[PDB]
Subunit: 330 residues, 2 copies
């Protein structure tokens, strides 16, 4: 059972920024932290999705209650021509792939909750709060808050101005202590800290991951065959000695290293043989020194990534999920 | 029983503009017209309120179904410090004064319906439609539509951008054929004609009254004693021979003349004695010719207005309504 300090470390490791450390520590002295993470359901998740998922896994390992919101209302509003059933098929795909990813990482799911936006974002009390918020929030602040998150468009739509407030109110309605997301959500998060108190609701802790450079880029799909994973990785950019901007090193730092707090580099005996790193900074140092070659770095990632993907591919080859995957993406 | 032509005349007389004459005539060939009128519940109605009320009376006389929306949600949002019970007290005051006004005018109320905004404007289907609308309406169009109707303010609030869409959706949710209001609502009305079809809903007919100059202006309250009605009228501006901009003539044209399609001018025998006008243009002509003096015009209005107010004052002197009136305006 982790101490409050150990929980804090699991929760905050690899994050770019934490807002609300004071409250975060107060909570962890007494009880488990409750965390909300929002995901859109419009795309098709590729391996980059393991970056947020690795933090979700840390949260669960630390004993947190984690609520994942599947933003099905927004998915509908962003293309109302699409039928509610294909949209919900994609919601189901996301729910199942998230479960499979976390099972593969190896964390307890008892305190993981899935909720759909449509479950409550059209409810009476929530809607009244959306209106209350609209009566205190200036159009200027609404626009500013979504500047990095809302699609930049020809003539901006009214919906974009409403989105920051819905995401803030989610924190209250999901009854959480904190919201996690990427640092690109910072203005949405500061908006929530400013305006929730206007409605008599507490500001929340905010946990922000960095915007991590992609492993490749086509992209490696979560269900790509091992053959295609290999081929796509072979094409990945990875400059020798380059530690500042390196998608391969980033994937190790944020996804692979955290699994067991180690990473094995596969290397020919000629160049020193395999080495097991127990701190990421040690791997960074060797890569900068050019004694871990890009090809060996990529081979090491390929092996570990395929291990991570194996059980997911297995599960999605069952009749029910095989059908789901192809239907969700006809 | 009025013919379709007679109904059309009752419905459209004194209006500044009609949008949708084609559909209006089609409907009246077959059935009764259904009309929505919206009223805020934030002020305290004075005699100018008889201007819209006179059209409501015409609609009822013509056999129309009339739905009056009491905008209690907006009343709350415009001052959230105010308690829901004082707000609802004012709603009750408005409902009771409207009933008393129409009873005094003398029209059948069987097809008059009162509804509160909160009865449905927070409901699930309506809210989904608000979101759908926000996904097709540009921020630019939202702002433009409310330019004459939304309070011009320091830093404009998000709520102002939502208001035009709610008023459009009201037309669909109240299941009406037409919305009536002042010509200052024209941009809200054209917005509704443009955007309701985007959601698969029919555009409505729009009936627009002129912005009628006030009788005085303090203002004559609907419950002012006869003494104060007299005193306030004596102070009303009324330039001899001035027919273009004359609040006294406007009140005759829009409120008093329509009661029986006549108006009696009280005048000393010295100047020709009383005269009964059966067309407003005849009174206008005599006033322009300066053979109806401002003092006699005002005396004639005073007598007729006090007749209109008498039964209202009577009703509001009953214990229950006396209590309501003072509580609603503590």
């Amino acid at each position: 059972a982790p101490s409050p300090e150990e929980k804090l470390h699991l929760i905050t490791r690899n994050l770019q920024e934490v807002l609300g450390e004071e409250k975060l520590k107060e909570i962890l002295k007494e009880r488990e932290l409750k965390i909300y993470w929002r995901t859109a359901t419009t795309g098709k998740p590729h391996v980059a999705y393991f970056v947020p998922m690795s933090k979700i896994a840390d949260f669960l390992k630390a004993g947190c209650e984690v609520t994942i919101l599947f933003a099905d209302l927004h998915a509908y509003l962003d293309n109302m021509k699409a039928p509610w059933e294909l949209l919900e098929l994609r919601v189901s795909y996301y729910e199942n792939v998230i479960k499979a990813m976390l099972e593969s990482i190896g964390v307890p799911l008892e305190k993981l909750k899935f909720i759909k936006g449509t479950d409550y974002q059209l409810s009476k009390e929530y809607t009244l709060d959306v209106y209350r918020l609209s009566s205190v929030v200036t159009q200027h602040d609404s626009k500013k808050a979504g500047a990095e998150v809302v699609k930049q468009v020809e003539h901006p739509l009214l919906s974009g101005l409403l989105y920051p407030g819905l995401q803030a109110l989610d924190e209250e309605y999901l009854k959480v202590d904190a919201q996690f997301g990427g640092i690109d959500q910072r203005k949405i998060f500061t908006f929530a800290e400013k305006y929730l108190p206007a409605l008599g609701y507490s500001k929340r802790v905010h946990l922000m991951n960095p915007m991590v450079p992609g492993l490749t880029g086509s992209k490696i799909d979560l269900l790509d065959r091992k053959e295609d994973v290999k081929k796509k990785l072979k094409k990945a950019f990875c400059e020798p000695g380059n530690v500042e901007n390196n998608g391969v090193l980033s994937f190790i730092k944020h996804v692979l290293f955290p699994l067991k707090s180690e990473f094995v580099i596969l290397r020919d005996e000629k160049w020193g043989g395999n080495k097991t790193y127990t701190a990421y900074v040690d791997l960074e140092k060797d890569f900068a020194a050019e004694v871990v070659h890009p090809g060996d770095l990529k081979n090491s990632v390929e092996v570990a990534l395929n291990k991570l993907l194996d059980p997911i591919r297995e599960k999605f080859n069952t009749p029910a999920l095989k059908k789901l995957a192809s239907a969700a993406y006809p």
